[PDB]
């Protein structure tokens, strides 16, 4: 029916976006991937040698293996009724650093040190984050003028 081919539904997603064709920027290769670095997968279209599949494009995994030109990444794949820890070799052009934990890594760094500021100063700063609370009972001011009377416009085509 449906031609179960590798690289099948990627008429658009294995393409360079627009006016970013040509040869690749070189700081793509001067990235440092250690074990446990959380990386996400976005397969390009210029390098043919190590593009993953159309199931990992847009997903995020974690580096378990580092070699000369590629990186082993352990991702989760939704197959029918269970998800599977799967491990793929992907060349280094197709990935980047996930910034999803990098806004967690600030608030473990500036949270551990602000904890020990309350031990020298003596308070209960409550360093845990809260959601957006309901708005405070504030006070609006119509100083000078009076409010504007608006009304719905008539219908004209």
- Give the separation between CA 82 and CA 78, rounded to whole angstroms: 6
Instruction: Provide, rounded to whole angstroms, the least separation between the CB of residue 135 and RNA.
Output: 14
Q: Which CB sits closer to RNA, 129 or 138?
A: 129
Q: Which residue has the tokens 């397969």?
A: 43
For the CA atoms of 17, 13, 95, 98, what is the dihedral angle to 10 degrees?
90
Q: CB of 42 within 8 A of CB of 98?
A: no
Instruction: Provide, rounded to whole angstroms, the least separation between the CB of residue 154 and RNA.
Output: 15
Q: Which CB sits closer to RNA, 19 or 145?
A: 19
Q: Which CB sits closer to RNA, 132 or 140?
A: 132
* Bridge partner residues of 83 (DSSP): 78
Q: Which CB sits closer to RNA, 32 or 142?
A: 32
Instruction: Provide, rounded to whole angstroms, the least separation between the CB of residue 151 and RNA.
Output: 15
Q: CB of 93 within 8 A of CB of 28?
A: yes
Distances (CA, A) of 149 to 62, 80, 142, 152, 155: 58, 58, 14, 10, 19
Instruction: Provide, rounded to whole angstroms, the least separation between the CB of residue 144 and RNA.
Output: 25
């Amino acid at each position: 029916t449906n031609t179960k081919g590798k690289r099948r539904g990627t008429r658009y997603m294995f393409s360079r976006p627009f006016r970013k064709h040509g040869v690749v920027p070189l700081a793509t290769y001067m990235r440092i991937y250690k074990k446990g670095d959380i990386v996400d997968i976005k397969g390009m279209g210029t390098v043919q040698k190590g593009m993953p599949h159309k199931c990992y494009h847009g997903k995020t995994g974690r580096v378990y293996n580092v070699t000369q030109h590629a990186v082993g990444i352990v991702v989760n794949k939704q197959v029918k009724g269970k998800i599977l820890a799967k491990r793929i070799n992907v060349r280094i052009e197709h990935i980047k650093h996930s910034k999803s934990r990098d806004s967690f890594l600030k608030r473990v760094k500036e949270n551990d040190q602000k904890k020990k500021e309350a031990k020298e100063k003596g308070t209960w700063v409550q360093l845990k984050r809260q959601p957006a609370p309901p708005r405070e009972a504030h006070f609006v001011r119509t100083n000078g003028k009076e409010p504007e009377l608006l009304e719905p416009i008539p219908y004209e085509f």
